[PDB]
Structure 1
Amino acid sequence: SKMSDVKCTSVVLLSVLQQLRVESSSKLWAQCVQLHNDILLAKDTTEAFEKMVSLLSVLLSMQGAVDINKLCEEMLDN
């Protein structure tokens, strides 16, 4: 339902973050792997929507890499 839609968006969020060569900083890849392994083992949709803000904020703090504007005006959340 809602706990299975968060558990599949955190598999696509650590693949976008693994294709951007975030594996080359082993002080931040060690936190992203702990916020993704912890969401998958969660048993409440109120304590897995707050590790999805920490994990998503890693992608929005990486500047140029992902064009957020283009990707949001691409028939998606406006």
Structure 2
Amino acid sequence: SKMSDVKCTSVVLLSVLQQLRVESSSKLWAQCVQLHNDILLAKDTTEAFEKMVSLLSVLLSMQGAVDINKLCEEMLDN
């Protein structure tokens, strides 16, 4: 149950990243696609988590993009 959760979270994260016009940079989009496709094919739940950290770092390293703090104060992420 800890593996399907991370696969669903990865799908949602890739959708959110695509909504922010990331595919307008070929290298970043290729890396994101590779990570997302690698997570869904995983068999053990440690490689999936490190790839998840790597994929989330892409969204976190975009200043304007989204508001981390507002999205953390809505009874959401801590």
TM-score, normalised with respect to structure 2:
0.97
Could you give the per-residue CA deviations for residues 14-41 of structure 1, whole angstroms, max 9, x where no partner exists? 0100000001000100000000000000
Pairs aligned (count): 78
> CA separation in 2, counterparts of 1:60 and 1:53?
10
**RMSD of the alignment, in Å?**
0.6
**What's the offset of the Cα at 1:68?**
0.3
* Larger helix percent: 2
Which 4+ residue blocks in structure 1 deviate beyond 3 angstroms? none
Could you give the per-residue CA deviations for residues 31-66 of structure 1, whole angstroms, max 9, x where no partner exists? 000000000000000110000011000000011111
Stretches of structure 1 lacking an aligned partner (at least 5 in a row): none
TM-score, normalised with respect to structure 1:
0.97
Identity %: 100
